[PDB]
Design a binder for this molecule. Structure first.
Ligand SMILES: Nc1ncnc2c1ncn2[C@H]1C[C@H](O)[C@@H](COP(=O)(O)CP(=O)(O)OP(=O)(O)O)O1
Ligand SMILES: [Mg+2]
Ligand code: NA
Ligand code: NA
Length: 326
DNA sequence: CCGACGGCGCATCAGC
DNA sequence: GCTGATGCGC
DNA sequence: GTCGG
């Protein structure tokens, strides 16, 4: 539904979420406010009262009261107060830097470091990840048009196959679901030589992507997970492309399609679909699907060579990534 | 009333 | 030096 | 903050 509908309420609730996460360090309250914001965002009527909102799952007594105040006055006193608080507003702002969480943000502000400018002046106090987040502060907040995501996929699949034609690589996330923009790029990688039974398999791929100057920085890298930065090549005379976030995950072959399913999402759909599998005698996670015995004891992971196999264990019919919004 | 609300890879800290 | 905890992001 | 055992 249109934002004008309840956008004021949803904006209020998201701002509250952010203060709970970044300032109060209350992650579960952050998620409570986000859940309330989502269900309200999907509500196809302009909310007239807190009572009306309370009928939705995730909206309770306190949010109902906040909605009543917002509706009667057009603001929320406590949010107005938080906004003008130099300490709170600065802490909340610094967490937009990738690598600066609530703990780091609090410490910086405690010592007089409140702005990106102060961060620039204080490089020695920033760890590697934080320096990268600062460097690309603006770029990391931009979204990625699907047309660029396709150019990016083109490079990733080409270079992976060039390293070893037996690798399998799948760009997952919202992109695989057919979205017209993405926040970042998620790549799942596997290889026949890597099973749960059985490295350098990930390194070889990261190395090649750096060699062709697609990967530009590294946030973290181990034997199964890479998190870093990449950029599309620019044409002479054209404005250069923003730097983008990319993650690459190496997963065992025998867990690969459970991973593709899971990392394609949405979370709504995942959380959603864990359900059916249960009621049908199955426990599912990002790695495996296992049968639940008559007392609830999990059996060995079931064999899986496709996304559809998973649906076929729970007697469902394949639903394309296109239709997995929920 | 009162505990769950996701869990885990990687980087870095804290303590030994 | 090593092992476990914490912070962070997802 | 909300839900639910
Ligand atoms: N809070 C959560 N709980 C459970 N699962 C979650 C999750 N957040 C993300 N996931 C899962 C599903 C995503 O497809 C996948 C990657 O999460 P992602 O952060 O890359 C979001 P996509 O779903 O990629 O949107 P976007 O990138 O275009 O903005 O991991
Ligand atoms: Mg993504
Ligand atoms: Na951050
Ligand atoms: Na952030």
């Amino acid at each position: 539904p249109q934002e004008t509908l309840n956008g004021g309420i949803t904006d209020m609730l998201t701002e509250l979420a952010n203060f709970e996460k970044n300032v109060s360090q209350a992650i579960h309250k952050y998620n409570a406010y986000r859940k309330a914001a989502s269900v309200i965002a999907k509500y196809p009527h302009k909310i007239k009262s807190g009572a009306e909102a309370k009928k939705l799952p995730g909206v309770g007594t306190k949010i109902a009261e906040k909605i009543d105040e917002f509706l009667a006055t057009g603001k929320l006193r406590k949010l107005e107060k938080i906004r003008q608080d130099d300490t709170s507003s600065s802490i909340n702002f610094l967490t937009r830097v990738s690598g600066i969480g609530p703990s780091a943000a609090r410490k910086f502000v405690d010592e007089g470091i409140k702005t990106l400018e102060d961060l620039r002046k204080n490089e020695d106090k920033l760890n590697h990840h934080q320096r990268i987040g600062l460097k690309y502060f603006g770029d990391f907040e931009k979204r990625i048009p699907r047309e660029e995501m396709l150019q990016m996929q083109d490079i990733v699949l080409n270079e992976v196959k060039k390293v070893d034609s037996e690798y399998i690589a799948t760009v997952c996330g919202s992109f695989r679901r057919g979205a017209e923009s993405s926040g970042d790029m998620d790549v799942l990688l596997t290889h026949p030589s890597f099973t749960s039974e059985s490295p350098k398999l990930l390194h070889q791929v990261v190395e090649q992507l750096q060699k062709v100057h697609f990967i530009t920085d590294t946030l973290s890298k181990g034997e199964t997970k890479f998190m870093g930065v990449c950029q599309l090549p620019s044409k002479n005379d054209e404005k250069e492309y923003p730097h983008r976030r990319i993650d690459i995950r190496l997963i065992p072959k025998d867990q690969y399609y459970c991973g593709v399913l899971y990392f394609t999402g949405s979370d709504i759909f995942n959380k959603n679909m864990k359900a059916h599998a249960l009621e049908k005698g199955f426990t599912i996670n990002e790695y495996t699907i296992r049968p639940l015995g008559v007392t609830g004891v999990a059996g060995e992971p079931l064999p899986v060579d496709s996304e559809k196999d998973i649906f076929d264990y729970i007697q469902w019919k394949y639903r394309e990534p296109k239709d997995r919004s929920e």
